[PDB]
Amino acid sequence: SHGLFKKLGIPGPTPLPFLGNILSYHKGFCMFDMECHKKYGKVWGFYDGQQPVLAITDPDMIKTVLVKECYSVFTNRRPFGPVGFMKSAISIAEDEEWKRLRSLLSPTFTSGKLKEMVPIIAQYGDVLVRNLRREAETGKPVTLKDVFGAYSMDVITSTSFGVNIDSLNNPQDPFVENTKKLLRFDFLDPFFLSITVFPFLIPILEVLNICVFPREVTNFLRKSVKRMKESRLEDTRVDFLQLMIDSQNKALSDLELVAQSIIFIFAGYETTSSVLSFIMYELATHPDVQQKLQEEIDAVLPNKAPPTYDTVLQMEYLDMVVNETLRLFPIAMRLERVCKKDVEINGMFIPKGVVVMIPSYALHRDPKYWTEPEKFLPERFSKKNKDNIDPYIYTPFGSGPRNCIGMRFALMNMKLALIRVLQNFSFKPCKETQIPLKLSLGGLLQPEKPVVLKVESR
Ligand SMILES: CCC[C@@H](CC[C@H](Cc1ccccc1)NC(=O)[C@@H](NC(=O)N(C)Cc1csc(C(C)C)n1)C(C)C)NC(=O)OCc1cncs1
Ligand code: HEM
């Protein structure tokens, strides 16, 4: 079975019985992919335990699996562990169910609805600047994840559900406290290690009602959503929560609604707050880029003018800065599609069962497509070098019918935060700042030490 790639004539490292290549993950699965790419070329194969995985790096091959063959062969992401009713969450859902969730939820983030969100978000950007000023009035080291997390939770909850939970004025906010415990995947956790390696365990666990997400956290998020939806129905603006009630009056069940809500809560909070922290980390450590960003905001928005939808969009360098951070810190380190039948794509035979894997981290740092791939140089994303960058090599939000539904939301939300912040403050590194930033070898894209900076006024 570990002789799949040999028989197919596909290069790749040599697997150990049972574990496969899993122990090559010890120095992070990102440096695993990079090392394999450099060594094997555009295509290689490996085994997450028994699960065979095919890694692809040729752009057209990527376009085929991501776009052309989505509905026909590559509809689904890897099955990953015991998930319970969260098996209905759009990102985890398969086939027909993903299909009907995708068109139910996709109208969430249209131009019109995105434009209506600005006033709401600008309000939380004002509380954010007020909070950062306190940390600036003292010169106290600030954990970026804390402050930007509270902001992001406030934005997603308000824009998604129409509710103010005032997380920004509330240190011990149940919403933040629970959500950051929601997923804590670790290769060092025998639980996550075991199901990562030996997937035959999973169906046993689903019976036992065991789940990758902690019970206390899903219960809390379940009753919080029950509450918020009960509110909406008792009141006498169409958002994500309203759309899902419309489909209740096939055939969306209550549990399926909470699933979608937990996904949206998690992305809004965790991904948004993380990307903001990496962006600010790179500004602090690149003082002139911070300076140059500060001057666009001034040129476009003079006399501390409030950002609007179109002012955000006119801002080229702020955009350059964000793309450059996503290039260095892609939240999804790999994109994955399960191959659900035998197919030949770009004169290459892929069998049913294999996980087709696109190593975004590696491709974002390939010396082939990027000169000085390892540094922070926003210029590489200029109006001029715009059709240099291949859309299938640079995939921070993925591609095709299963790309990020919240992409323009998160881009707008982050830029609105960045604009408010940078028109008031300056971020400098301290002794408490880890330079260079090392990433955790554990799970998601997170720093090994939390991002800690000082905040100066203007
Ligand atoms: C509530 C939490 C559920 C998780 C679980 C599904 C997810 C797949 C996914 C990732 C990114 C965007 C969309 C879907 N899984 C992961 O996040 C995993 N990480 C990955 O992204 N990988 C697939 C890479 C990876 C890490 S370990 C591994 C195997 C060796 C087991 N593969 C976790 C478990 C570490 N995802 C989720 O809900 O994502 C919502 C988002 C949308 N946009 C940004 S976040
Ligand atoms: C900077 C923040 C974010 C980054 C970097 C990001 C990135 C991604 C990536 C790379 C994918 C997978 C695409 C693929 O497989 O090709 C994805 C999936 C998804 N994302 Fe985003 N995301 C972000 C924030 C959000 C937000 C704010 C939401 C909405 C609240 C969101 C909702 C989704 C959903 C629902 C999916 C799965 C879509 C599907 O399977 O049909 N993410 N995210």
Curated annotation (Swiss-Prot):
| Expressed in which tissues | Expressed in prostate and liver. According to some authors, it is not expressed in brain. According to others, weak levels of expression are measured in some brain locations. Also expressed in epithelium of the small intestine and large intestine, bile duct, nasal mucosa, kidney, adrenal cortex, epithelium of the gastric mucosa with intestinal metaplasia, gallbladder, intercalated ducts of the pancreas, chief cells of the parathyroid and the corpus luteum of the ovary (at protein level).
* Positions with a binding annotation for heme: 404
CDD domains reported for this sequence? CYP3A
Per the record, the pathway is: Steroid hormone biosynthesis; Cofactor metabolism; retinol metabolism; Steroid metabolism; cholesterol metabolism; Lipid metabolism; fatty acid metabolism
Provide the disulphide bond pattern: none
Principal location class: endoplasmic reticulum
Q: Superkingdom of this entry's organism?
A: Eukaryota
Q: What is this enzyme's EC?
A: 1.14.14.1, 1.14.14.56, 1.14.14.73, 1.14.14.55
Species name: Homo sapiens
Under catalytic activity, the entry for this protein gives: an organic molecule + reduced [NADPH--hemoprotein reductase] + O2 = an alcohol + oxidized [NADPH--hemoprotein reductase] + H2O + H(+); 17beta-estradiol + reduced [NADPH--hemoprotein reductase] + O2 = 2-hydroxy-17beta-estradiol + oxidized [NADPH--hemoprotein reductase] + H2O + H(+); 17beta-estradiol + reduced [NADPH--hemoprotein reductase] + O2 = 4-hydroxy-17beta-estradiol + oxidized [NADPH--hemoprotein reductase] + H2O + H(+); 17beta-estradiol + reduced [NADPH--hemoprotein reductase] + O2 = 16alpha,17beta-estriol + oxidized [NADPH--hemoprotein reductase] + H2O + H(+)
What is the name listed in the Swiss-Prot or TrEMBL entry for this protein? Cytochrome P450 3A4
Q: How is its activity regulated?
A: Activated by cytochrome b5.
Q: What is the effect of changing residue 190 to R?
A: In allele CYP3A4*5
Cite the effect that the entry attributes to residue 28 to D: In allele CYP3A4*7
Further comment: Chimeric transcripts, characterized by CYP3A43 exon 1 joined at canonical splice sites to distinct sets of CYP3A4 exons, have been detected. All are possibly produced by trans-splicing. The chimeric transcripts exist in 3 different combinations: CYP3A43 exon 1 joined in frame to CYP3A4 exons 2-13, CYP3A43 exon 1 joined in frame to CYP3A4 exons 4-13 and CYP3A43 exon 1 joined in frame to CYP3A4 exon 7-13. The longest chimeric isoform (CYP3A43 exon 1 joined to CYP3A4 exons 2-13) exhibits 6-beta-hydroxylase activity, while a shorter isoform (CYP3A43 exon 1 joined to CYP3A4 exons 4-13) does not.
Membrane topology term: Single-pass membrane protein
Q: Which Pfam families match?
A: p450
**Posttranslational mods:** Polyubiquitinated in the presence of AMFR and UBE2G1 and also STUB1/CHIP and UBE2D1 (in vitro).
What changing residue 157 to S does, per the record, is: In allele CYP3A4*16
GO function terms (MF aspect): 1,8-cineole 2-exo-monooxygenase activity; 1-alpha,25-dihydroxyvitamin D3 23-hydroxylase activity; anandamide 11,12 epoxidase activity; anandamide 14,15 epoxidase activity; anandamide 8,9 epoxidase activity; caffeine oxidase activity; enzyme binding; estrogen 16-alpha-hydroxylase activity
Upon changing residue 194 to P, the result is: In allele CYP3A4*2; exhibits a lower intrinsic clearance toward nifedipine
Assembly and partners? Interacts with PGRMC1; the interaction requires PGRMC1 homodimerization.
Xref: PROSITE patterns: CYTOCHROME_P450 (PS00086)
Q: Which UniProt keywords apply?
A: Disease variant, Endoplasmic reticulum, Fatty acid metabolism, Heme, Iron, Lipid biosynthesis, Lipid metabolism, Membrane, Metal-binding, Microsome, Monooxygenase, Oxidoreductase, Steroid biosynthesis, Steroid metabolism, Sterol metabolism, Transmembrane, Transmembrane helix, Ubl conjugation
